[PDB]
Short mmCIF file of C-alpha atoms and ligand atoms in Angstrom, two decimals:
data_model
loop_
_atom_site.label_atom_id
_atom_site.label_comp_id
_atom_site.label_asym_id
_atom_site.label_seq_id
_atom_site.Cartn_x
_atom_site.Cartn_y
_atom_site.Cartn_z
CA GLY A 1 -37.49 -64.08 -44.34
CA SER A 2 -35.18 -63.56 -47.47
CA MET A 3 -34.10 -59.87 -48.06
CA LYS A 4 -32.76 -58.59 -51.22
CA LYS A 5 -31.31 -55.27 -52.36
CA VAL A 6 -32.71 -53.74 -55.71
CA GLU A 7 -30.21 -51.79 -57.60
CA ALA A 8 -31.12 -49.52 -60.53
CA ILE A 9 -28.88 -47.49 -62.52
CA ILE A 10 -30.99 -44.97 -64.40
CA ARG A 11 -30.96 -41.65 -66.23
CA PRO A 12 -30.91 -38.85 -63.43
CA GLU A 13 -33.82 -36.86 -65.16
CA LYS A 14 -35.81 -40.09 -64.18
CA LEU A 15 -35.16 -39.98 -60.86
CA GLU A 16 -38.13 -37.89 -59.72
CA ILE A 17 -40.79 -39.96 -61.65
CA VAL A 18 -39.39 -43.21 -60.80
CA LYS A 19 -39.00 -42.17 -56.83
CA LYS A 20 -42.56 -41.10 -57.03
CA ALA A 21 -44.00 -44.11 -58.87
CA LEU A 22 -41.93 -46.22 -55.94
CA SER A 23 -43.45 -44.16 -53.11
CA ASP A 24 -47.05 -44.42 -54.50
CA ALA A 25 -46.64 -48.30 -54.38
CA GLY A 26 -45.29 -48.21 -50.67
CA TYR A 27 -41.64 -48.51 -51.32
CA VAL A 28 -40.36 -45.27 -49.30
CA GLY A 29 -37.05 -46.40 -47.96
CA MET A 30 -34.32 -45.83 -50.98
CA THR A 31 -31.00 -44.26 -50.78
CA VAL A 32 -29.82 -42.33 -53.96
CA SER A 33 -26.23 -41.71 -55.02
CA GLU A 34 -24.82 -39.94 -57.97
CA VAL A 35 -22.57 -41.80 -60.45
CA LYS A 36 -21.26 -42.09 -63.66
CA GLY A 37 -21.66 -44.55 -66.38
CA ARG A 38 -20.70 -45.11 -70.15
CA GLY A 39 -22.57 -42.99 -72.50
CA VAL A 40 -24.50 -44.56 -75.73
CA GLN A 41 -21.45 -43.85 -78.34
CA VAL A 55 -14.74 -41.32 -74.01
CA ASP A 56 -15.76 -39.77 -71.06
CA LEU A 57 -18.47 -41.34 -68.70
CA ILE A 58 -21.60 -39.51 -67.92
CA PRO A 59 -23.72 -38.69 -64.81
CA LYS A 60 -26.27 -41.23 -63.71
CA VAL A 61 -28.33 -42.26 -60.79
CA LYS A 62 -28.02 -45.10 -58.56
CA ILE A 63 -31.16 -45.88 -56.63
CA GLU A 64 -30.68 -48.66 -53.78
CA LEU A 65 -33.74 -50.36 -52.16
CA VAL A 66 -33.90 -53.21 -49.86
CA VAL A 67 -37.01 -55.33 -49.85
CA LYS A 68 -38.58 -58.49 -49.06
CA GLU A 69 -37.95 -61.01 -51.70
CA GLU A 70 -41.53 -61.60 -52.43
CA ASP A 71 -41.54 -57.60 -53.39
CA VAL A 72 -38.59 -57.86 -56.00
CA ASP A 73 -40.53 -58.58 -59.16
CA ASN A 74 -43.11 -55.54 -58.28
CA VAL A 75 -40.19 -53.30 -57.58
CA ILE A 76 -38.37 -54.12 -60.93
CA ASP A 77 -41.65 -53.67 -62.78
CA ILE A 78 -42.32 -50.18 -61.37
CA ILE A 79 -38.66 -49.26 -62.03
CA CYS A 80 -38.67 -50.36 -65.78
CA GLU A 81 -41.78 -48.77 -66.21
CA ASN A 82 -41.20 -45.38 -65.15
CA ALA A 83 -37.19 -45.42 -65.95
CA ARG A 84 -37.50 -46.29 -69.48
CA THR A 85 -37.46 -44.12 -72.38
CA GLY A 86 -36.94 -46.47 -75.42
CA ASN A 87 -33.46 -44.93 -76.26
CA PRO A 88 -30.02 -47.05 -75.50
CA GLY A 89 -28.65 -45.80 -72.07
CA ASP A 90 -31.99 -46.60 -70.01
CA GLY A 91 -30.10 -48.49 -67.71
CA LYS A 92 -29.68 -51.67 -65.62
CA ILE A 93 -31.14 -53.20 -62.35
CA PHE A 94 -29.35 -55.69 -60.15
CA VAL A 95 -30.57 -57.97 -57.28
CA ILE A 96 -27.98 -58.34 -54.64
CA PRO A 97 -28.47 -60.65 -51.40
CA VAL A 98 -29.17 -59.11 -48.11
CA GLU A 99 -28.30 -61.58 -45.29
CA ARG A 100 -29.08 -59.09 -42.51
CA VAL A 101 -30.89 -55.73 -42.02
CA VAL A 102 -30.67 -53.52 -38.49
CA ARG A 103 -32.51 -50.60 -37.73
CA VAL A 104 -29.92 -48.11 -36.12
CA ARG A 105 -32.29 -46.36 -33.54
CA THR A 106 -33.79 -49.68 -32.25
CA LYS A 107 -31.58 -52.31 -33.39
CA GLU A 108 -34.39 -54.31 -34.50
CA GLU A 109 -33.77 -56.68 -37.56
CA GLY A 110 -35.27 -58.43 -40.52
CA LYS A 111 -38.72 -57.00 -42.02
CA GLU A 112 -39.57 -55.01 -38.60
CA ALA A 113 -36.37 -52.88 -39.62
CA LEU A 114 -37.84 -51.86 -42.87
CA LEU A 115 -41.19 -50.48 -41.77
CA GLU A 116 -42.62 -48.12 -38.86
CA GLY B 1 -23.96 -69.54 -65.13
CA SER B 2 -24.29 -66.85 -62.22
CA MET B 3 -23.30 -63.18 -62.36
CA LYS B 4 -20.99 -61.36 -59.90
CA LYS B 5 -20.31 -57.85 -59.08
CA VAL B 6 -16.73 -56.95 -59.09
CA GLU B 7 -15.98 -53.74 -57.00
CA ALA B 8 -12.55 -52.24 -56.91
CA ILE B 9 -11.91 -49.19 -54.74
CA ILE B 10 -8.88 -47.49 -56.34
CA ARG B 11 -6.58 -44.20 -56.75
CA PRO B 12 -8.42 -41.68 -58.84
CA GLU B 13 -5.36 -41.30 -60.97
CA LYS B 14 -5.47 -44.85 -61.92
CA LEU B 15 -9.02 -44.45 -63.27
CA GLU B 16 -8.33 -43.83 -66.91
CA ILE B 17 -6.10 -46.48 -67.18
CA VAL B 18 -8.36 -49.07 -65.49
CA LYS B 19 -11.21 -48.23 -67.42
CA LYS B 20 -9.45 -48.13 -71.02
CA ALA B 21 -7.78 -51.62 -70.07
CA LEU B 22 -11.02 -53.07 -69.05
CA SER B 23 -12.69 -51.61 -72.35
CA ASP B 24 -9.96 -53.11 -74.45
CA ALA B 25 -10.92 -56.31 -72.78
CA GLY B 26 -14.44 -55.83 -73.87
CA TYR B 27 -15.81 -54.97 -70.35
CA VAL B 28 -17.59 -51.64 -71.14
CA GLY B 29 -20.38 -51.61 -68.84
CA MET B 30 -19.13 -50.10 -65.60
CA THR B 31 -20.47 -47.62 -63.01
CA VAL B 32 -18.05 -45.12 -61.31
CA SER B 33 -18.57 -43.36 -57.98
CA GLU B 34 -16.35 -40.78 -55.96
CA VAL B 35 -15.92 -41.92 -52.62
CA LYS B 36 -13.43 -41.48 -49.63
CA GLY B 37 -11.33 -44.14 -47.59
CA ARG B 38 -7.88 -44.11 -45.77
CA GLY B 39 -5.80 -42.48 -44.83
CA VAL B 55 -7.81 -34.63 -42.71
CA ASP B 56 -8.26 -38.47 -42.34
CA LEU B 57 -10.19 -39.66 -45.38
CA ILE B 58 -8.83 -39.09 -48.92
CA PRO B 59 -10.52 -39.46 -52.23
CA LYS B 60 -10.90 -42.64 -54.07
CA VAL B 61 -12.71 -44.00 -56.93
CA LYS B 62 -15.08 -47.13 -56.99
CA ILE B 63 -15.66 -49.11 -59.96
CA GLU B 64 -18.44 -51.59 -60.01
CA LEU B 65 -18.91 -54.07 -62.96
CA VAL B 66 -21.30 -57.02 -63.07
CA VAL B 67 -20.17 -59.80 -65.36
CA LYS B 68 -20.38 -63.53 -65.76
CA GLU B 69 -18.72 -65.72 -62.78
CA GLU B 70 -16.49 -66.88 -65.59
CA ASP B 71 -14.90 -63.63 -66.15
CA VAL B 72 -14.26 -62.73 -62.71
CA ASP B 73 -10.50 -63.55 -62.48
CA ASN B 74 -9.77 -61.65 -65.87
CA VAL B 75 -11.50 -58.68 -64.64
CA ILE B 76 -9.63 -58.76 -61.33
CA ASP B 77 -6.34 -59.41 -63.06
CA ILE B 78 -6.86 -56.38 -65.33
CA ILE B 79 -7.95 -54.13 -62.26
CA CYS B 80 -4.94 -55.40 -60.23
CA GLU B 81 -2.14 -54.68 -63.12
CA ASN B 82 -3.58 -51.18 -64.03
CA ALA B 83 -4.52 -49.86 -60.90
CA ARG B 84 -1.27 -51.13 -58.64
CA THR B 85 1.58 -48.74 -57.93
CA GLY B 86 3.53 -50.68 -55.34
CA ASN B 87 2.68 -48.17 -52.38
CA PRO B 88 0.17 -48.64 -49.77
CA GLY B 89 -3.27 -47.28 -50.39
CA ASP B 90 -3.71 -49.20 -54.21
CA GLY B 91 -6.68 -50.69 -53.10
CA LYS B 92 -9.07 -53.46 -52.66
CA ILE B 93 -11.23 -55.48 -54.65
CA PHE B 94 -14.69 -57.38 -53.53
CA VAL B 95 -16.73 -59.74 -55.23
CA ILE B 96 -20.26 -59.88 -54.28
CA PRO B 97 -22.94 -62.14 -55.56
CA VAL B 98 -25.83 -60.80 -57.99
CA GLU B 99 -28.95 -63.13 -58.43
CA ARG B 100 -30.51 -61.07 -61.09
CA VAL B 101 -29.75 -58.54 -63.65
CA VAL B 102 -32.50 -56.67 -66.01
CA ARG B 103 -32.29 -54.33 -68.72
CA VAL B 104 -34.72 -51.46 -68.10
CA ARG B 105 -35.44 -50.52 -71.75
CA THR B 106 -36.26 -54.14 -72.89
CA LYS B 107 -36.80 -55.82 -69.56
CA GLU B 108 -34.45 -58.68 -70.90
CA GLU B 109 -32.62 -60.52 -67.88
CA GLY B 110 -29.68 -62.45 -67.31
CA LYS B 111 -26.75 -62.92 -70.09
CA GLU B 112 -28.95 -61.05 -72.60
CA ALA B 113 -29.35 -58.31 -70.36
CA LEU B 114 -25.30 -57.79 -69.79
CA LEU B 115 -24.91 -56.99 -73.33
CA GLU B 116 -24.16 -53.18 -73.94
CA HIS B 117 -25.42 -51.44 -76.79
CA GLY C 1 -13.85 -67.70 -42.60
CA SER C 2 -16.13 -65.56 -44.60
CA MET C 3 -16.18 -62.02 -45.38
CA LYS C 4 -19.16 -59.93 -45.10
CA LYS C 5 -19.80 -56.36 -46.14
CA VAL C 6 -21.68 -54.09 -43.48
CA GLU C 7 -23.15 -50.78 -45.02
CA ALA C 8 -24.59 -48.34 -42.99
CA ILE C 9 -26.49 -45.22 -44.05
CA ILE C 10 -26.28 -42.55 -41.17
CA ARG C 11 -26.76 -38.95 -40.53
CA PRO C 12 -23.70 -37.00 -41.91
CA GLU C 13 -23.10 -35.29 -38.58
CA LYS C 14 -22.77 -38.88 -37.03
CA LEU C 15 -19.64 -39.61 -39.38
CA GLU C 16 -16.91 -38.50 -37.55
CA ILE C 17 -17.97 -40.14 -34.15
CA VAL C 18 -18.90 -43.46 -35.89
CA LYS C 19 -15.71 -43.25 -37.80
CA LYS C 20 -13.67 -42.61 -34.47
CA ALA C 21 -15.27 -45.35 -32.58
CA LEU C 22 -14.96 -47.81 -35.58
CA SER C 23 -10.93 -46.92 -35.74
CA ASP C 24 -10.67 -47.46 -31.59
CA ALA C 25 -12.07 -50.77 -31.98
CA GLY C 26 -9.62 -51.76 -35.04
CA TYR C 27 -11.72 -51.27 -37.68
CA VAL C 28 -9.77 -48.83 -39.85
CA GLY C 29 -10.62 -49.82 -43.47
CA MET C 30 -13.78 -48.04 -44.51
CA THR C 31 -15.00 -46.36 -47.42
CA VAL C 32 -17.56 -43.38 -47.21
CA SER C 33 -19.65 -42.02 -49.92
CA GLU C 34 -22.41 -38.65 -49.90
CA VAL C 35 -25.78 -40.16 -50.75
CA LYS C 36 -29.46 -39.02 -50.32
CA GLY C 37 -32.20 -40.88 -48.57
CA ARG C 38 -35.62 -40.77 -47.33
CA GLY C 39 -37.31 -42.80 -44.97
CA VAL C 40 -40.46 -44.58 -44.64
CA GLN C 41 -42.79 -41.77 -43.06
CA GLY C 42 -43.27 -38.17 -44.22
CA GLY C 43 -39.80 -36.78 -45.20
CA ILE C 44 -38.38 -33.47 -43.74
CA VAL C 45 -41.20 -30.42 -43.19
CA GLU C 46 -39.42 -27.08 -43.16
CA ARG C 47 -41.11 -23.39 -43.38
CA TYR C 48 -40.31 -20.60 -45.68
CA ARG C 49 -42.71 -17.36 -44.82
CA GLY C 50 -45.71 -18.83 -43.15
CA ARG C 51 -46.10 -22.32 -44.78
CA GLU C 52 -44.34 -25.66 -44.81
CA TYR C 53 -42.55 -27.32 -48.06
CA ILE C 54 -41.27 -30.74 -48.29
CA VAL C 55 -37.58 -32.09 -48.86
CA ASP C 56 -38.03 -35.81 -49.84
CA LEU C 57 -34.17 -36.64 -50.26
CA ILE C 58 -32.03 -35.47 -47.70
CA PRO C 59 -28.16 -35.85 -47.48
CA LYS C 60 -26.93 -38.91 -45.87
CA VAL C 61 -23.65 -40.94 -45.56
CA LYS C 62 -22.91 -44.35 -46.73
CA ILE C 63 -20.23 -46.12 -44.71
CA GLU C 64 -18.99 -49.51 -46.23
CA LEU C 65 -16.72 -51.68 -44.17
CA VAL C 66 -15.96 -55.54 -45.08
CA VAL C 67 -14.96 -57.54 -42.23
CA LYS C 68 -14.73 -61.09 -40.89
CA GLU C 69 -17.93 -62.46 -40.37
CA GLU C 70 -17.07 -62.93 -36.71
CA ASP C 71 -16.49 -59.39 -36.51
CA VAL C 72 -20.20 -58.27 -37.86
CA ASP C 73 -22.30 -58.10 -34.60
CA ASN C 74 -19.42 -55.89 -33.01
CA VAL C 75 -19.32 -53.67 -36.11
CA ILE C 76 -23.10 -53.26 -35.98
CA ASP C 77 -23.02 -52.65 -32.12
CA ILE C 78 -20.53 -49.99 -32.49
CA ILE C 79 -22.37 -48.16 -35.51
CA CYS C 80 -25.70 -48.22 -33.67
CA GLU C 81 -24.40 -46.97 -30.43
CA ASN C 82 -22.41 -44.16 -31.95
CA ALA C 83 -24.88 -43.19 -34.85
CA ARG C 84 -28.13 -43.28 -32.94
CA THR C 85 -29.98 -39.90 -31.71
CA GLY C 86 -33.43 -41.76 -30.85
CA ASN C 87 -35.07 -39.71 -33.63
CA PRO C 88 -36.77 -41.05 -36.78
CA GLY C 89 -33.80 -40.93 -39.51
CA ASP C 90 -30.87 -42.61 -37.55
CA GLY C 91 -30.28 -44.86 -40.44
CA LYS C 92 -29.97 -48.59 -41.55
CA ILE C 93 -27.51 -51.32 -41.82
CA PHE C 94 -27.44 -54.06 -44.38
CA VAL C 95 -25.10 -57.09 -44.26
CA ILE C 96 -24.04 -58.23 -47.75
CA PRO C 97 -22.13 -61.26 -48.88
CA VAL C 98 -18.67 -60.83 -50.11
CA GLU C 99 -17.32 -63.86 -51.79
CA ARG C 100 -13.65 -62.37 -52.45
CA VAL C 101 -11.53 -59.93 -51.19
CA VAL C 102 -8.49 -59.19 -53.32
CA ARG C 103 -5.55 -56.73 -52.50
CA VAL C 104 -4.53 -54.80 -55.56
CA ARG C 105 -0.89 -54.15 -54.69
CA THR C 106 -0.18 -57.85 -53.62
CA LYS C 107 -3.11 -60.00 -54.99
CA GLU C 108 -3.37 -61.33 -51.53
CA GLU C 109 -6.75 -62.70 -50.93
CA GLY C 110 -9.14 -63.29 -47.98
CA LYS C 111 -8.15 -62.39 -44.27
CA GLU C 112 -4.67 -61.74 -45.62
CA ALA C 113 -6.19 -58.85 -47.82
CA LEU C 114 -8.04 -57.07 -44.87
CA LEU C 115 -5.09 -56.67 -42.75
CA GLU C 116 -4.06 -52.88 -43.13
N1 ADP D 201 -35.61 -50.05 -47.71
C1 ADP D 201 -34.44 -49.11 -48.07
N2 ADP D 201 -33.63 -49.63 -48.73
C2 ADP D 201 -32.59 -48.83 -48.74
N3 ADP D 201 -32.51 -47.91 -48.23
C3 ADP D 201 -33.01 -47.27 -47.20
C4 ADP D 201 -34.33 -48.26 -46.97
N4 ADP D 201 -34.96 -47.61 -45.78
C5 ADP D 201 -34.34 -46.36 -45.43
N5 ADP D 201 -33.20 -46.32 -46.03
C6 ADP D 201 -32.18 -45.37 -45.87
O1 ADP D 201 -32.00 -45.30 -44.42
C7 ADP D 201 -32.20 -43.89 -44.14
C8 ADP D 201 -33.04 -43.71 -42.89
O2 ADP D 201 -34.44 -44.36 -43.29
P1 ADP D 201 -35.32 -44.07 -41.95
O3 ADP D 201 -36.69 -45.00 -42.09
O4 ADP D 201 -35.71 -42.31 -42.02
O5 ADP D 201 -34.34 -44.34 -40.63
P2 ADP D 201 -35.22 -44.87 -39.16
O6 ADP D 201 -35.31 -46.34 -39.50
O7 ADP D 201 -34.09 -44.56 -38.35
O8 ADP D 201 -36.50 -44.05 -39.19
C9 ADP D 201 -32.93 -43.14 -45.35
O9 ADP D 201 -32.57 -41.88 -45.42
C10 ADP D 201 -32.28 -43.76 -46.54
O10 ADP D 201 -30.95 -43.64 -46.97
#
């Protein structure tokens, strides 16, 4: 099928709630990085990047969950990007496609 | 039309000048990460990521190259990656409307 | 031809071996970052005094390499061979399309830009 990477750049204090909400909905595989982005308004400030690769059919749901749980109503809540992924491979089994996501 | 992610891996001492040049040209939304590349083998680099309208890619690339170059090996590389969707977290706005920074 | 980004999220203790193997096969241009990950099931379970506690996010390393499409299979083989342990949490590889590669110094593009 089609696989997509959902990248969200959010406030660092929102990581725990967002990751919990994602986990509760069955999205447990995620990668988390520390990054910097512009402040609201000159130094950049800390943000968190969450990356999740999912089935294309799950993108809307993932985006809804992230938006609901990451938002505060103030400028600087962040942005989400969807990027095509053409191949996914599990390291330990060399499995590919959606199989590589599960277990 | 479409959106693209422009990723540049550059020298850490070039971050300020690049960021200022991009800002002056109206590109204020960028994400910065501390990474390592070549090259004790791996040395510190900075990854800049900006998602822009397709029409702005050439201009962004020009600005980054102009301001990040030194003429020595290790100046870095720029990748352009397709972005199929952009969503503003607070408002749930999408596409070009989501790209405006406030 | 086309360029592809190979991203691998692996165990931090596998970075040196993977990087060496990649280098020996001619892939020297790579970017490495420190990230945190969690896998599908459980999360790691450690013990304090008599009881267990869970650490959800644990340190991983992200390697990113942009290569000619023709080299993807080989990159993936090398990473898997050298990053695997047989235990859950070995990691994942994603292949992402790259539409343009530009060398900052020269503004060369394409295969010219990957040659280091
Ligand atoms: N769907 C996903 N999206 C993004 N990153 C993921 C995803 N699933 C797993 N990862 C990353 O890969 C690492 C290993 O995942 P895990 O499922 O534990 O590996 P394995 O497939 O070997 O069991 C995690 O620590 C995380 O960084």
